[PDB]
PDB file of C-alpha atoms and ligand atoms in Angstrom:
ATOM      1  CA  UNK P   1      31.562  45.365 -65.997  1.00 31.53           C
ATOM      2  CA  UNK P   2      30.407  42.560 -63.802  1.00 28.51           C
ATOM      3  CA  UNK P   3      26.828  41.425 -63.371  1.00 28.97           C
ATOM      4  CA  UNK P   4      26.311  39.053 -60.476  1.00 29.63           C
ATOM      5  CA  UNK P   5      23.234  36.991 -61.303  1.00 29.99           C
ATOM      6  CA  UNK P   6      21.741  35.367 -58.202  1.00 28.39           C
ATOM      7  CA  UNK P   7      18.924  32.821 -58.058  1.00 29.72           C
ATOM      8  CA  UNK P   8      17.021  32.966 -54.774  1.00 31.08           C
ATOM      9  CA  UNK P   9      13.907  31.282 -56.200  1.00 27.40           C
ATOM     10  CA  UNK P  10      12.905  27.825 -54.984  1.00 25.25           C
ATOM     11  CA  UNK P  11      13.204  26.599 -58.575  1.00 24.28           C
ATOM     12  CA  UNK P  12      16.025  26.418 -61.051  1.00 25.91           C
ATOM     13  CA  UNK P  13      16.321  29.242 -63.502  1.00 29.71           C
ATOM     14  CA  UNK P  14      18.356  29.160 -66.661  1.00 31.74           C
ATOM     15  CA  UNK P  15      19.816  32.640 -66.709  1.00 31.28           C
ATOM     16  CA  UNK P  16      20.262  34.327 -70.077  1.00 31.05           C
ATOM     17  CA  UNK P  17      22.314  37.307 -71.214  1.00 30.70           C
ATOM     18  CA  UNK P  18      22.294  38.692 -74.763  1.00 35.04           C
ATOM     19  CA  UNK P  19      22.421  41.877 -76.774  1.00 30.33           C
ATOM     20  CA  UNK P  20      20.078  40.435 -79.390  1.00 28.99           C
ATOM     21  CA  UNK P  21      22.533  39.444 -82.092  1.00 28.09           C
ATOM     22  CA  UNK P  22      25.121  37.917 -79.772  1.00 28.33           C
ATOM     23  CA  UNK P  23      25.602  36.346 -76.379  1.00 25.39           C
ATOM     24  CA  UNK P  24      26.918  38.357 -73.483  1.00 26.54           C
ATOM     25  CA  UNK P  25      29.609  36.266 -71.815  1.00 26.90           C
ATOM     26  CA  UNK P  26      28.551  32.605 -72.127  1.00 27.16           C
ATOM     27  CA  UNK P  27      24.962  33.639 -72.932  1.00 27.26           C
ATOM     28  CA  UNK P  28      23.261  31.271 -70.528  1.00 27.69           C
ATOM     29  CA  UNK P  29      23.761  29.041 -67.520  1.00 28.23           C
ATOM     30  CA  UNK P  30      21.667  26.777 -65.313  1.00 27.09           C
ATOM     31  CA  UNK P  31      21.285  28.207 -61.800  1.00 26.81           C
ATOM     32  CA  UNK P  32      19.748  25.842 -59.311  1.00 27.72           C
ATOM     33  CA  UNK P  33      18.145  27.421 -56.253  1.00 28.99           C
ATOM     34  CA  UNK P  34      20.769  29.404 -54.359  1.00 29.14           C
ATOM     35  CA  UNK P  35      23.341  29.486 -57.148  1.00 28.01           C
ATOM     36  CA  UNK P  36      25.006  32.564 -58.599  1.00 26.57           C
ATOM     37  CA  UNK P  37      26.752  33.357 -61.873  1.00 28.83           C
ATOM     38  CA  UNK P  38      28.979  36.370 -62.405  1.00 28.80           C
ATOM     39  CA  UNK P  39      29.327  37.495 -65.988  1.00 29.71           C
ATOM     40  CA  UNK P  40      31.451  40.119 -67.627  1.00 29.98           C
ATOM     41  CA  UNK P  41      29.788  42.557 -69.986  1.00 30.19           C
ATOM     42  CA  UNK P  42      32.183  44.570 -72.100  1.00 31.13           C
ATOM     43  CA  UNK P  43      32.308  48.320 -71.561  1.00 34.87           C
ATOM     44  CA  UNK P  44      30.413  50.264 -74.201  1.00 37.14           C
ATOM     45  CA  UNK P  45      27.823  47.518 -74.741  1.00 38.57           C
ATOM     46  CA  UNK P  46      24.385  48.842 -75.678  1.00 38.22           C
ATOM     47  CA  UNK P  47      21.060  47.040 -75.693  1.00 37.58           C
ATOM     48  CA  UNK P  48      22.048  44.276 -73.282  1.00 39.52           C
ATOM     49  CA  UNK P  49      19.440  42.208 -71.479  1.00 38.21           C
ATOM     50  CA  UNK P  50      19.442  39.621 -68.704  1.00 36.06           C
ATOM     51  CA  UNK P  51      16.465  37.406 -67.937  1.00 36.78           C
ATOM     52  CA  UNK P  52      15.370  34.188 -66.273  1.00 36.43           C
ATOM     53  CA  UNK P  53      14.128  31.169 -68.173  1.00 34.11           C
ATOM     54  CA  UNK P  54      11.992  28.646 -66.340  1.00 31.96           C
ATOM     55  CA  UNK P  55      11.584  24.905 -66.758  1.00 29.80           C
ATOM     56  CA  UNK P  56      14.085  24.096 -69.460  1.00 31.36           C
ATOM     57  CA  UNK P  57      14.911  20.827 -71.190  1.00 32.29           C
ATOM     58  CA  UNK P  58      18.337  20.730 -72.863  1.00 27.79           C
ATOM     59  CA  UNK P  59      20.356  17.919 -74.398  1.00 26.89           C
ATOM     60  CA  UNK P  60      24.097  17.537 -73.795  1.00 26.03           C
ATOM     61  CA  UNK P  61      24.875  19.864 -76.714  1.00 27.03           C
ATOM     62  CA  UNK P  62      22.764  22.651 -75.202  1.00 26.70           C
ATOM     63  CA  UNK P  63      19.737  22.420 -77.487  1.00 27.65           C
ATOM     64  CA  UNK P  64      16.129  22.014 -76.385  1.00 24.91           C
ATOM     65  CA  UNK P  65      13.417  24.306 -75.031  1.00 20.86           C
ATOM     66  CA  UNK P  66      12.297  26.432 -72.075  1.00 24.59           C
ATOM     67  CA  UNK P  67       8.750  27.034 -70.798  1.00 24.16           C
ATOM     68  CA  UNK P  68       9.464  30.757 -70.550  1.00 24.46           C
ATOM     69  CA  UNK P  69      12.104  32.923 -72.163  1.00 24.98           C
ATOM     70  CA  UNK P  70      13.378  30.433 -74.735  1.00 25.61           C
ATOM     71  CA  UNK P  71      16.106  31.817 -77.023  1.00 29.78           C
ATOM     72  CA  UNK P  72      16.035  29.784 -80.238  1.00 28.15           C
ATOM     73  CA  UNK P  73      16.169  26.545 -78.276  1.00 29.19           C
ATOM     74  CA  UNK P  74      19.682  27.154 -76.917  1.00 26.38           C
ATOM     75  CA  UNK P  75      21.158  26.952 -73.436  1.00 24.22           C
ATOM     76  CA  UNK P  76      23.693  29.622 -74.361  1.00 26.28           C
ATOM     77  CA  UNK P  77      21.559  32.456 -75.701  1.00 23.56           C
ATOM     78  CA  UNK P  78      22.665  34.421 -78.693  1.00 22.57           C
ATOM     79  CA  UNK P  79      19.315  36.140 -79.214  1.00 23.74           C
ATOM     80  CA  UNK P  80      16.489  37.444 -77.059  1.00 24.70           C
ATOM     81  CA  UNK P  81      13.942  35.241 -75.333  1.00 24.94           C
ATOM     82  CA  UNK P  82      10.319  34.409 -75.988  1.00 25.45           C
ATOM     83  CA  UNK P  83       7.795  36.252 -73.791  1.00 25.81           C
ATOM     84  CA  UNK P  84       6.874  36.184 -71.002  1.00 26.87           C
ATOM     85  CA  UNK P  85      10.160  37.481 -69.585  1.00 26.03           C
ATOM     86  CA  UNK P  86      10.893  40.032 -66.872  1.00 25.23           C
ATOM     87  CA  UNK P  87      13.835  41.989 -68.356  1.00 27.25           C
ATOM     88  CA  UNK P  88      16.898  43.627 -66.857  1.00 28.22           C
ATOM     89  CA  UNK P  89      18.042  46.062 -69.558  1.00 29.32           C
ATOM     90  CA  UNK P  90      21.242  48.050 -69.807  1.00 27.78           C
ATOM     91  CA  UNK P  91      23.518  50.130 -71.966  1.00 29.01           C
ATOM     92  CA  UNK P  92      26.980  50.856 -70.606  1.00 29.50           C
ATOM     93  CA  UNK P  93      29.393  53.755 -71.135  1.00 27.17           C
ATOM     94  CA  UNK P  94      27.069  55.800 -73.337  1.00 25.61           C
ATOM     95  CA  UNK P  95      28.619  59.282 -73.209  1.00 26.38           C
ATOM     96  CA  UNK P  96      30.049  58.676 -69.767  1.00 28.74           C
ATOM     97  CA  UNK P  97      27.026  57.024 -68.147  1.00 28.73           C
ATOM     98  CA  UNK P  98      25.345  53.661 -67.716  1.00 29.13           C
ATOM     99  CA  UNK P  99      21.555  53.299 -68.211  1.00 27.39           C
ATOM    100  CA  UNK P 100      19.584  50.530 -66.497  1.00 23.09           C
ATOM    101  CA  UNK P 101      15.936  49.575 -66.241  1.00 24.71           C
ATOM    102  CA  UNK P 102      13.504  46.749 -65.696  1.00 29.40           C
ATOM    103  CA  UNK P 103      10.884  46.116 -68.353  1.00 29.11           C
ATOM    104  CA  UNK P 104       7.567  44.279 -68.510  1.00 26.42           C
ATOM    105  CA  UNK P 105       7.145  45.149 -72.210  1.00 24.66           C
ATOM    106  CA  UNK P 106       7.658  41.456 -73.020  1.00 25.09           C
ATOM    107  CA  UNK P 107       5.692  40.307 -69.981  1.00 22.35           C
ATOM    108  CA  UNK P 108       6.686  38.935 -66.607  1.00 24.73           C
ATOM    109  CA  UNK P 109       7.843  35.512 -65.491  1.00 22.99           C
ATOM    110  CA  UNK P 110      10.171  35.767 -62.473  1.00 24.30           C
ATOM    111  CA  UNK P 111      10.441  38.535 -59.843  1.00 29.67           C
ATOM    112  CA  UNK P 112      13.611  40.557 -60.207  1.00 28.76           C
ATOM    113  CA  UNK P 113      15.822  43.081 -58.426  1.00 31.64           C
ATOM    114  CA  UNK P 114      18.392  44.928 -60.560  1.00 27.95           C
ATOM    115  CA  UNK P 115      20.777  46.971 -58.434  1.00 26.08           C
ATOM    116  CA  UNK P 116      24.119  48.719 -58.845  1.00 27.77           C
ATOM    117  CA  UNK P 117      26.964  47.872 -56.473  1.00 27.09           C
ATOM    118  CA  UNK P 118      27.644  51.581 -55.961  1.00 26.11           C
ATOM    119  CA  UNK P 119      25.973  54.222 -53.810  1.00 24.99           C
ATOM    120  CA  UNK P 120      26.003  56.479 -56.866  1.00 25.98           C
ATOM    121  CA  UNK P 121      22.620  55.398 -58.228  1.00 28.07           C
ATOM    122  CA  UNK P 122      19.565  53.434 -57.140  1.00 24.91           C
ATOM    123  CA  UNK P 123      18.322  49.980 -58.025  1.00 21.53           C
ATOM    124  CA  UNK P 124      15.058  48.835 -59.566  1.00 20.16           C
ATOM    125  CA  UNK P 125      12.723  46.025 -58.528  1.00 17.54           C
ATOM    126  CA  UNK P 126       9.710  44.270 -59.992  1.00 18.85           C
ATOM    127  CA  UNK P 127       8.713  41.602 -57.526  1.00 17.94           C
ATOM    128  CA  UNK P 128       4.941  41.842 -57.072  1.00 16.76           C
ATOM    129  CA  UNK P 129       2.583  38.878 -57.526  1.00 14.89           C
ATOM    130  CA  UNK P 130       1.959  39.514 -61.196  1.00 12.43           C
ATOM    131  CA  UNK P 131       1.378  35.876 -62.155  1.00 10.70           C
ATOM    132  CA  UNK P 132      -1.300  35.401 -59.459  1.00 11.53           C
ATOM    133  CA  UNK P 133      -3.126  38.575 -60.510  1.00 13.35           C
ATOM    134  CA  UNK P 134      -2.596  38.139 -64.270  1.00 11.12           C
ATOM    135  CA  UNK P 135      -5.773  38.831 -66.288  1.00 11.55           C
ATOM    136  CA  UNK P 136      -7.075  35.637 -67.895  1.00  9.82           C
ATOM    137  CA  UNK P 137      -6.362  36.758 -71.449  1.00  6.26           C
ATOM    138  CA  UNK P 138      -2.693  37.441 -70.586  1.00  5.09           C
ATOM    139  CA  UNK P 139      -2.021  34.208 -68.703  1.00  8.12           C
ATOM    140  CA  UNK P 140       0.801  32.169 -70.156  1.00  9.02           C
ATOM    141  CA  UNK P 141       0.204  28.425 -69.754  1.00  7.35           C
ATOM    142  CA  UNK P 142       3.960  27.865 -69.370  1.00  7.42           C
ATOM    143  CA  UNK P 143       3.969  30.144 -66.381  1.00  7.61           C
ATOM    144  CA  UNK P 144       4.073  33.869 -66.402  1.00  3.49           C
ATOM    145  CA  UNK P 145       1.995  36.771 -67.612  1.00  3.99           C
ATOM    146  CA  UNK P 146       2.209  37.839 -71.247  1.00  4.19           C
ATOM    147  CA  UNK P 147       2.264  41.418 -72.394  1.00  4.52           C
ATOM    148  CA  UNK P 148      -0.662  42.464 -74.562  1.00  4.28           C
ATOM    149  CA  UNK P 149       1.485  42.955 -77.676  1.00  4.87           C
ATOM    150  CA  UNK P 150       2.472  39.280 -77.598  1.00  2.00           C
ATOM    151  CA  UNK P 151      -1.143  38.220 -77.165  1.00  2.00           C
ATOM    152  CA  UNK P 152      -3.019  40.569 -79.491  1.00  2.00           C
ATOM    153  CA  UNK P 153      -0.429  41.712 -82.056  1.00  2.00           C
ATOM    154  CA  UNK P 154      -1.963  45.113 -82.820  1.00  2.00           C
ATOM    155  CA  UNK P 155      -0.364  48.556 -82.782  1.00  2.00           C
ATOM    156  CA  UNK P 156      -2.582  49.596 -79.865  1.00  2.00           C
ATOM    157  CA  UNK P 157      -0.415  47.278 -77.793  1.00  2.00           C
ATOM    158  CA  UNK P 158       2.756  46.874 -79.873  1.00  2.63           C
ATOM    159  CA  UNK P 159       3.391  50.577 -80.607  1.00  2.00           C
ATOM    160  CA  UNK P 160       4.449  49.921 -84.198  1.00  2.00           C
ATOM    161  CA  UNK P 161       2.665  52.925 -85.750  1.00  4.95           C
ATOM    162  CA  UNK P 162       1.656  56.392 -84.552  1.00  5.15           C
ATOM    163  CA  UNK P 163       1.751  57.131 -80.830  1.00  7.50           C
ATOM    164  CA  UNK P 164       0.475  54.313 -78.637  1.00  5.51           C
ATOM    165  CA  UNK P 165      -0.663  55.056 -75.106  1.00  5.63           C
ATOM    166  CA  UNK P 166      -1.442  53.164 -71.917  1.00  8.18           C
ATOM    167  CA  UNK P 167      -4.065  50.419 -72.059  1.00  6.18           C
ATOM    168  CA  UNK P 168      -5.872  48.279 -69.512  1.00  7.39           C
ATOM    169  CA  UNK P 169      -3.138  45.696 -70.015  1.00  5.89           C
ATOM    170  CA  UNK P 170      -0.193  48.068 -69.609  1.00  4.89           C
ATOM    171  CA  UNK P 171      -1.835  49.568 -66.513  1.00  4.96           C
ATOM    172  CA  UNK P 172      -2.075  46.069 -65.009  1.00  6.32           C
ATOM    173  CA  UNK P 173       1.724  45.782 -65.047  1.00  3.43           C
ATOM    174  CA  UNK P 174       2.328  49.437 -64.201  1.00  3.25           C
ATOM    175  CA  UNK P 175       0.350  49.476 -60.955  1.00  4.81           C
ATOM    176  CA  UNK P 176       2.047  46.302 -59.785  1.00  5.71           C
ATOM    177  CA  UNK P 177       5.538  47.511 -60.790  1.00  7.13           C
ATOM    178  CA  UNK P 178       5.631  51.286 -61.164  1.00  7.11           C
ATOM    179  CA  UNK P 179       9.377  51.300 -61.689  1.00  6.16           C
ATOM    180  CA  UNK P 180       9.277  49.008 -64.759  1.00  5.79           C
ATOM    181  CA  UNK P 181       8.341  49.835 -68.341  1.00  7.37           C
ATOM    182  CA  UNK P 182       4.778  48.675 -68.980  1.00  9.93           C
ATOM    183  CA  UNK P 183       4.542  49.436 -72.718  1.00  9.23           C
ATOM    184  CA  UNK P 184       6.954  50.711 -75.365  1.00 10.80           C
ATOM    185  CA  UNK P 185       6.173  54.427 -74.926  1.00 11.22           C
ATOM    186  CA  UNK P 186       5.794  54.372 -71.145  1.00  7.35           C
ATOM    187  CA  UNK P 187       7.346  57.350 -69.390  1.00  8.31           C
ATOM    188  CA  UNK P 188      10.917  56.129 -68.910  1.00 10.61           C
ATOM    189  CA  UNK P 189      11.949  54.696 -65.523  1.00  8.83           C
ATOM    190  CA  UNK P 190      15.547  54.295 -66.651  1.00  8.47           C
ATOM    191  CA  UNK P 191      18.166  54.952 -63.977  1.00  8.66           C
ATOM    192  CA  UNK P 192      21.348  56.826 -64.865  1.00  8.99           C
ATOM    193  CA  UNK P 193      24.402  55.334 -63.180  1.00  8.53           C
ATOM    194  CA  UNK P 194      28.026  56.439 -63.269  1.00  6.84           C
ATOM    195  CA  UNK P 195      29.783  55.023 -66.297  1.00  8.71           C
ATOM    196  CA  UNK P 196      31.519  51.687 -65.649  1.00 11.46           C
ATOM    197  CA  UNK P 197      29.431  50.630 -62.657  1.00 10.52           C
ATOM    198  CA  UNK P 198      28.853  46.993 -61.680  1.00 11.60           C
ATOM    199  CA  UNK P 199      25.530  45.313 -60.929  1.00 13.18           C
ATOM    200  CA  UNK P 200      23.607  42.515 -59.252  1.00 17.79           C
ATOM    201  CA  UNK P 201      20.501  40.873 -60.697  1.00 21.34           C
ATOM    202  CA  UNK P 202      18.574  38.870 -58.098  1.00 22.99           C
ATOM    203  CA  UNK P 203      15.763  36.494 -59.001  1.00 24.10           C
ATOM    204  CA  UNK P 204      13.173  36.212 -56.217  1.00 23.24           C
ATOM    205  CA  UNK P 205      14.546  39.038 -54.034  1.00 19.69           C
ATOM    206  CA  UNK P 206      13.690  39.478 -50.330  1.00 16.63           C
ATOM    207  CA  UNK P 207      15.303  42.341 -48.360  1.00 15.46           C
TER     208      UNK P 207
HETATM  209  N1  MHA O 301      10.350  34.983 -53.000  1.00 16.25           N
HETATM  210  C1  MHA O 301       9.902  34.589 -54.186  1.00 16.25           C
HETATM  211  O1  MHA O 301      10.073  35.268 -55.189  1.00 16.25           O
HETATM  212  C2  MHA O 301       9.178  33.255 -54.201  1.00 16.25           C
HETATM  213  N2  MHA O 301       8.754  32.812 -55.541  1.00 16.25           N
HETATM  214  C3  MHA O 301       8.216  31.438 -55.479  1.00 16.25           C
HETATM  215  C4  MHA O 301       9.312  30.411 -55.339  1.00 16.25           C
HETATM  216  O2  MHA O 301      10.506  30.777 -55.451  1.00 16.25           O
HETATM  217  O3  MHA O 301       8.944  29.234 -55.106  1.00 16.25           O
HETATM  218  C5  MHA O 301       7.725  33.702 -56.111  1.00 16.25           C
HETATM  219  C6  MHA O 301       7.834  33.696 -57.617  1.00 16.25           C
HETATM  220  O4  MHA O 301       8.723  32.992 -58.143  1.00 16.25           O
HETATM  221  O5  MHA O 301       7.031  34.411 -58.263  1.00 16.25           O
END
């Protein structure tokens, strides 16, 4: 499946694509403003994620750091990124269907549209001014708005035991982006697409 990753932000993003224990395609690439990168994700892949990293500093070998979304200090991500990161999440060809969503469970850094190329299912967007409205305790100095699990590290927010529910901090994200997951046990906003669809992820969407 192809994922066309498009940077319409004024700033460079270092796109990242991983399934947690391995890169998807090349795993990462620098996208200056206006640049695109089309990756191939193998059919049947589960637990894939795409995200933006902002303000990165890499040496020629591809090692360094990013202000948001860093993945073990690598340009070409093998693992997932450090919050805060708006997440495009997908599992493909799971019993005949693809499953896509956007998540704020690991916070928000860059506004995102995640859309199929087909009429057969809808897209998702989280593009509200979350960083400008971010509660003080969730502000990330590197840019972005942390989730409460990252900040407070308790089950109330991290949903590690029992049955967590919404909190003031999940509701902050949820009102701004109703179609994105705001905490681990949020009512799912996953979209079911026909199996083997293709997709476009746009950073800083407009129309
Ligand atoms: N249209 C946009 O998304 C503009 N961007 C700002 C920019 O690209 O300079 C907002 C953001 O990055 O949160």
